[PDB]
């Protein structure tokens, strides 16, 4: 079955024919895989800070006011291509030069990860330059692949250089500092998730990214200090600090936020013996 030919013929995207992509019923047929995710999510929930958020004009803001240092940063600057490709923005759009000027290195923890939504065009290249500037190494590329099961078939094509129809977005993952999978299992649980998210294309004017990106980040890094830059009211989430220009209210207090991670608490979630016995690990050397 040639699903490329089938798209040409019918407008149904090839990704429409991938089976069993839903998040909730994912491992319904594999109780031990489901148990690993269930137990890790319970561990995240038990240790989550209550939601915190700050309205801020990020281009004018002194980013060093966000403390303490962050174990993970999720960055979703509003690219003009989100609205133009699908429609008129109700906030300032950011160029890649604007994004690059952010001083992310001033708030990242010495060992930490970043997840940068880059779109599907020049951002795949310019986001890599931003990673370099901030002191990260590109280490994974999480692709959000969009199905069109509800409204086949062929849609927008606005980028004079593009030659294929663009049906995905890339979230680049970067690593800062030294992390060794064999010795740093108190900081990361590798290989729990895959670098793909598959959902139906959102409604017109809906620029949200799939909530599964939070699950991938939270499963992967045991650091509890999580920053979502350019988040909105609708993305506020326990375990996260959300900072963005369109937030309509602010509850962030830097001292109170930091107190959740300091003694007698830890900035790490810890782990249970049950999760240690279920999670993927290397064999003996």
């Amino acid at each position: 079955n040639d699903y490329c030919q089938h798209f040409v013929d019918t407008g149904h995207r090839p990704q429409n024919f991938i089976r069993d992509v839903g998040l909730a019923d994912r491992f319904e047929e594999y109780p031990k895989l489901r148990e690993l995710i269930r137990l890790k999510d319970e561990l995240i929930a038990k240790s989550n800070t209550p939601p915190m958020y700050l309205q801020a004009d990020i281009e004018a803001f002194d980013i060093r006011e966000l403390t303490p240092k962050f174990d993970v940063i999720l960055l979703e600057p509003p690219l003009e291509e989100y609205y133009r490709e699908t429609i008129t923005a109700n906030e300032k759009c950011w160029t890649w030069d604007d994004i690059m000027k952010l001083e992310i290195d001033e708030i990242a923890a010495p060992r930490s990860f970043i997840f940068l939504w880059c779109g599907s065009g020049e951002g795949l290249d310019l986001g890599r330059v931003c990673l370099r500037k901030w002191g990260y190494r590109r280490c994974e590329d999480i692709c959000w692949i969009k199905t069109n099961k509800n409204n086949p078939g062929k849609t927008k094509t606005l980028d004079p250089k593009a030659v294929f129809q663009r049906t995905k977005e890339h979230c680049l993952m970067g690593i800062k500092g030294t992390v060794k999978r064999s010795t740093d299992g108190d900081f990361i649980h590798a290989n729990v998730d895959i670098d793909l998210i598959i959902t139906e294309e959102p409604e017109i004017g809906n620029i949200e990214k799939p909530v599964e990106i939070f699950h991938i980040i939270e499963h992967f890094c045991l650091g509890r200090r999580r920053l979502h830059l350019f988040g909105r009211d609708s993305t506020i989430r326990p375990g996260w600090l959300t900072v963005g220009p369109t937030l309509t209210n602010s509850n962030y207090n830097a001292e109170t936020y930091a107190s959740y991670f300091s003694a007698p608490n830890s900035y790490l979630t810890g782990c249970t013996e049950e999760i240690e016995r279920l999670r993927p690990k290397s064999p003996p050397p």
Binding site: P14, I18, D20, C139, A162, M173, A190, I194, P280
Partner: peptide
């Protein structure tokens, strides 16, 4: 000007989610 991805499926058109098939993810 573009980047194609080939999504690898198994015999039942599903994603292979298990194993350790990348360094981090």
């Amino acid at each position: 000007v573009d980047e194609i991805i080939w999504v690898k499926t198994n015999q039942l058109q599903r994603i292979i989610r298990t194993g350790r098939t990348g360094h981090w993810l």
